[PDB]
Coordinates of all heavy atoms in Angstrom, one line a residue:
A442 N -14.3 3.1 -9.0 CA -15.6 2.5 -8.5 C -15.4 1.2 -7.8 O -14.3 0.6 -8.1 CB -16.5 2.4 -9.7
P443 N -16.2 0.8 -6.9 CA -16.1 -0.5 -6.2 C -15.9 -1.7 -7.1 O -15.0 -2.5 -6.9 CB -17.4 -0.6 -5.4 CG -17.8 0.8 -5.2 CD -17.4 1.5 -6.4
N444 N -16.7 -1.8 -8.2 CA -16.7 -2.9 -9.1 C -15.3 -3.2 -9.7 O -15.0 -4.4 -9.9 CB -17.7 -2.7 -10.3 CG -17.3 -1.7 -11.3 OD1 -17.5 -0.5 -11.0 ND2 -16.7 -2.1 -12.4
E445 N -14.5 -2.2 -9.9 CA -13.2 -2.3 -10.6 C -12.0 -2.5 -9.6 O -10.9 -2.8 -10.0 CB -12.9 -1.2 -11.6 CG -12.7 0.1 -10.9 CD -12.6 1.3 -11.9 OE1 -11.9 1.1 -12.9 OE2 -13.3 2.3 -11.7
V446 N -12.3 -2.5 -8.3 CA -11.2 -2.7 -7.3 C -11.5 -4.0 -6.5 O -10.5 -4.5 -5.9 CB -11.1 -1.5 -6.3 CG1 -10.9 -0.2 -7.1 CG2 -12.2 -1.4 -5.3
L447 N -12.7 -4.4 -6.4 CA -13.0 -5.6 -5.5 C -12.2 -6.8 -6.1 O -12.1 -7.0 -7.3 CB -14.5 -6.0 -5.5 CG -15.4 -5.0 -4.8 CD1 -16.9 -5.1 -5.2 CD2 -15.3 -5.2 -3.3
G448 N -11.6 -7.6 -5.2 CA -10.8 -8.8 -5.5 C -9.3 -8.4 -5.9 O -8.6 -9.4 -6.1
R449 N -9.0 -7.1 -5.9 CA -7.6 -6.6 -6.2 C -6.9 -6.3 -4.9 O -7.6 -5.9 -3.9 CB -7.6 -5.4 -7.1 CG -8.2 -5.6 -8.5 CD -7.2 -5.1 -9.5 NE -7.3 -3.7 -9.9 CZ -6.3 -3.1 -10.5 NH1 -5.1 -3.7 -10.7 NH2 -6.5 -1.8 -10.9
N450 N -5.6 -6.4 -4.9 CA -4.7 -5.9 -3.8 C -4.6 -4.4 -4.0 O -4.5 -3.9 -5.2 CB -3.4 -6.6 -3.7 CG -2.5 -6.0 -2.7 OD1 -2.0 -4.9 -2.8 ND2 -2.2 -6.8 -1.6
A451 N -4.7 -3.6 -2.9 CA -4.8 -2.1 -3.0 C -3.5 -1.5 -3.6 O -3.5 -0.3 -3.9 CB -5.0 -1.6 -1.6
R452 N -2.5 -2.3 -3.9 CA -1.2 -1.8 -4.4 C -1.3 -1.1 -5.8 O -0.4 -0.4 -6.2 CB -0.1 -2.8 -4.3 CG -0.2 -3.9 -5.4 CD 0.9 -4.9 -5.5 NE 1.2 -5.5 -4.2 CZ 0.6 -6.6 -3.8 NH1 -0.2 -7.3 -4.5 NH2 0.9 -7.1 -2.6
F453 N -2.4 -1.3 -6.5 CA -2.7 -0.7 -7.8 C -2.7 0.8 -7.6 O -2.5 1.5 -8.6 CB -3.9 -1.3 -8.4 CG -5.2 -0.9 -7.7 CD1 -5.8 0.3 -7.8 CD2 -5.8 -1.9 -6.9 CE1 -7.0 0.6 -7.1 CE2 -7.0 -1.6 -6.2 CZ -7.5 -0.3 -6.3
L454 N -2.9 1.3 -6.4 CA -3.0 2.8 -6.1 C -1.6 3.4 -6.2 O -1.5 4.6 -6.2 CB -3.6 3.0 -4.7 CG -5.1 2.7 -4.6 CD1 -5.5 2.7 -3.2 CD2 -5.9 3.6 -5.4
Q455 N -0.5 2.6 -6.2 CA 0.9 3.1 -6.2 C 1.3 3.4 -7.6 O 0.6 2.9 -8.6 CB 1.8 2.0 -5.5 CG 1.4 1.9 -4.0 CD 1.9 0.6 -3.4 OE1 2.8 -0.1 -3.9 NE2 1.4 0.3 -2.2
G456 N 2.4 4.1 -7.8 CA 2.9 4.5 -9.1 C 4.4 4.8 -9.1 O 5.1 4.5 -8.1
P457 N 4.9 5.4 -10.2 CA 6.4 5.6 -10.4 C 7.1 6.3 -9.2 O 8.2 5.9 -8.9 CB 6.4 6.4 -11.6 CG 5.2 6.1 -12.4 CD 4.1 6.0 -11.3
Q458 N 6.5 7.3 -8.6 CA 7.2 8.2 -7.5 C 6.9 7.6 -6.1 O 7.3 8.3 -5.1 CB 6.8 9.6 -7.7
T459 N 6.1 6.5 -6.0 CA 5.8 6.0 -4.6 C 7.1 5.5 -4.0 O 7.9 4.8 -4.7 CB 4.8 4.8 -4.7 OG1 3.6 5.3 -5.3 CG2 4.5 4.2 -3.3
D460 N 7.4 5.9 -2.7 CA 8.6 5.6 -2.0 C 8.7 4.1 -1.7 O 7.8 3.6 -1.0 CB 8.7 6.4 -0.7 CG 9.9 6.2 0.1 OD1 10.7 5.3 -0.1 OD2 10.1 7.0 1.1
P461 N 9.6 3.3 -2.2 CA 9.7 1.9 -2.0 C 9.9 1.5 -0.6 O 9.5 0.4 -0.2 CB 10.8 1.4 -2.9 CG 11.6 2.6 -3.4 CD 10.7 3.8 -3.1
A462 N 10.6 2.3 0.2 CA 10.8 2.1 1.7 C 9.5 2.1 2.4 O 9.3 1.2 3.3 CB 11.8 3.1 2.2
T463 N 8.6 3.0 2.0 CA 7.2 3.1 2.6 C 6.5 1.8 2.3 O 5.8 1.2 3.2 CB 6.5 4.3 2.1 OG1 7.3 5.4 2.4 CG2 5.1 4.5 2.8
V464 N 6.5 1.3 1.1 CA 5.9 0.1 0.6 C 6.4 -1.1 1.4 O 5.6 -1.9 1.9 CB 6.0 -0.1 -0.9 CG1 5.5 -1.5 -1.3 CG2 5.4 1.0 -1.7
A465 N 7.7 -1.2 1.6 CA 8.3 -2.3 2.4 C 7.9 -2.3 3.8 O 7.6 -3.4 4.4 CB 9.8 -2.2 2.3
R466 N 7.7 -1.1 4.4 CA 7.2 -1.0 5.8 C 5.8 -1.5 5.9 O 5.4 -2.2 6.9 CB 7.3 0.4 6.4 CG 8.7 0.8 6.7 CD 8.9 2.1 7.5 NE 8.2 3.2 6.9 CZ 8.8 4.0 6.0 NH1 10.0 3.8 5.5 NH2 8.1 5.1 5.5
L467 N 4.9 -1.2 4.9 CA 3.5 -1.7 4.9 C 3.6 -3.2 4.7 O 2.8 -3.9 5.4 CB 2.8 -1.1 3.7 CG 2.5 0.5 3.8 CD1 1.9 1.0 2.5 CD2 1.6 0.8 5.0
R468 N 4.4 -3.7 3.8 CA 4.5 -5.2 3.5 C 4.8 -5.9 4.8 O 4.2 -6.9 5.1 CB 5.6 -5.4 2.5 CG 5.7 -6.9 2.1 CD 6.6 -7.1 0.9 NE 8.0 -6.6 1.1 CZ 8.5 -5.6 0.5 NH1 7.7 -4.9 -0.4 NH2 9.7 -5.2 0.7
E469 N 5.8 -5.4 5.6 CA 6.2 -6.1 6.9 C 5.1 -6.0 7.9 O 4.8 -7.0 8.6 CB 7.5 -5.5 7.4 CG 8.7 -5.8 6.4 CD 10.0 -6.2 7.1 OE1 10.0 -6.7 8.2 OE2 11.1 -5.8 6.5
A470 N 4.4 -4.9 8.0 CA 3.3 -4.7 9.0 C 2.2 -5.7 8.7 O 1.7 -6.3 9.6 CB 2.8 -3.3 9.0
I471 N 1.8 -5.8 7.4 CA 0.6 -6.6 7.0 C 1.0 -8.1 7.3 O 0.2 -8.9 7.9 CB 0.2 -6.4 5.6 CG1 -0.4 -5.0 5.5 CG2 -0.6 -7.5 5.1 CD1 -0.5 -4.5 4.1
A472 N 2.3 -8.5 7.0 CA 2.7 -9.9 7.2 C 2.7 -10.3 8.7 O 2.4 -11.4 9.0 CB 4.1 -10.0 6.7
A473 N 2.9 -9.3 9.6 CA 2.9 -9.5 11.0 C 1.6 -9.1 11.7 O 1.5 -9.2 12.9 CB 4.0 -8.7 11.6
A474 N 0.6 -8.6 10.9 CA -0.7 -8.1 11.4 C -0.5 -7.0 12.5 O -1.1 -7.1 13.6 CB -1.6 -9.2 11.9
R475 N 0.5 -6.1 12.2 CA 0.8 -5.0 13.1 C 0.1 -3.7 12.6 O 0.1 -3.5 11.4 CB 2.3 -4.7 13.2 CG 3.1 -5.8 13.9 CD 4.5 -5.5 14.1 NE 5.3 -5.4 12.8 CZ 5.5 -4.2 12.2 NH1 5.0 -3.1 12.6 NH2 6.2 -4.3 11.0
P476 N -0.4 -2.8 13.4 CA -0.9 -1.6 13.0 C 0.2 -0.6 12.5 O 1.3 -0.7 13.1 CB -1.6 -1.0 14.2 CG -0.9 -1.7 15.4 CD -0.6 -3.0 14.9
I477 N -0.1 0.1 11.5 CA 0.9 1.0 10.8 C 0.2 2.2 10.2 O -0.9 2.1 9.7 CB 1.7 0.3 9.8 CG1 2.9 1.1 9.2 CG2 0.8 -0.3 8.7 CD1 3.9 0.3 8.5
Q478 N 0.9 3.4 10.2 CA 0.4 4.6 9.5 C 1.6 5.1 8.7 O 2.7 5.0 9.1 CB -0.1 5.7 10.5 CG -1.0 5.2 11.6 CD -0.3 4.6 12.8 OE1 0.6 5.2 13.3 NE2 -0.7 3.4 13.2
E479 N 1.3 5.4 7.4 CA 2.3 6.0 6.5 C 1.6 7.1 5.6 O 0.4 7.0 5.4 CB 2.8 4.9 5.5 CG 3.6 3.8 6.3 CD 4.9 4.2 6.8 OE1 5.4 5.3 6.3 OE2 5.5 3.4 7.5
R480 N 2.4 8.1 5.3 CA 2.0 9.1 4.2 C 2.6 8.6 2.9 O 3.9 8.6 2.8 CB 2.5 10.5 4.6 CG 2.0 11.6 3.6 CD 2.4 13.0 4.1 NE 2.3 14.0 3.1 CZ 3.2 14.4 2.3 NH1 4.4 13.9 2.4 NH2 3.0 15.4 1.4
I481 N 1.8 8.0 2.0 CA 2.3 7.4 0.8 C 1.7 8.0 -0.4 O 0.5 8.5 -0.4 CB 2.0 5.8 0.8 CG1 2.6 5.1 -0.3 CG2 0.5 5.6 0.9 CD1 2.6 3.6 -0.2
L482 N 2.6 8.2 -1.5 CA 2.1 8.8 -2.8 C 1.3 7.7 -3.5 O 1.8 6.6 -3.8 CB 3.3 9.3 -3.6 CG 2.9 10.0 -4.8 CD1 2.4 11.4 -4.5 CD2 4.1 10.1 -5.8
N483 N 0.1 8.1 -3.8 CA -0.8 7.2 -4.6 C -1.3 7.9 -5.9 O -1.0 9.1 -6.0 CB -2.0 6.7 -3.8 CG -1.7 5.6 -2.8 OD1 -2.6 5.2 -2.1 ND2 -0.5 5.0 -2.8

């Protein structure tokens, strides 16, 4: 629900099998404000 995600970073959607290389690509894109698309396990 919205109430339990507002003010949180979306990374709470990630878990044990999430590909760390995919997460690192998102981290770099956000830091540079570059558009990015990934298929990520949530």
Side-chain angles (χ1 to χ4, degrees), residues 442-457 459-483:
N444 69 278
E445 68 186 314
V446 311
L447 289 162
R449 297 235 269 160
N450 178 290
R452 72 174 56 89
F453 65 77
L454 290 171
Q455 294 160 16
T459 303
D460 182 349
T463 307
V464 174
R466 286 194 304 274
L467 296 173
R468 180 170 60 248
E469 294 218 31
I471 290 164
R475 291 188 293 94
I477 185 161
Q478 311 87 49
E479 295 289 348
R480 187 178 165 261
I481 187 169
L482 188 73
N483 281 178

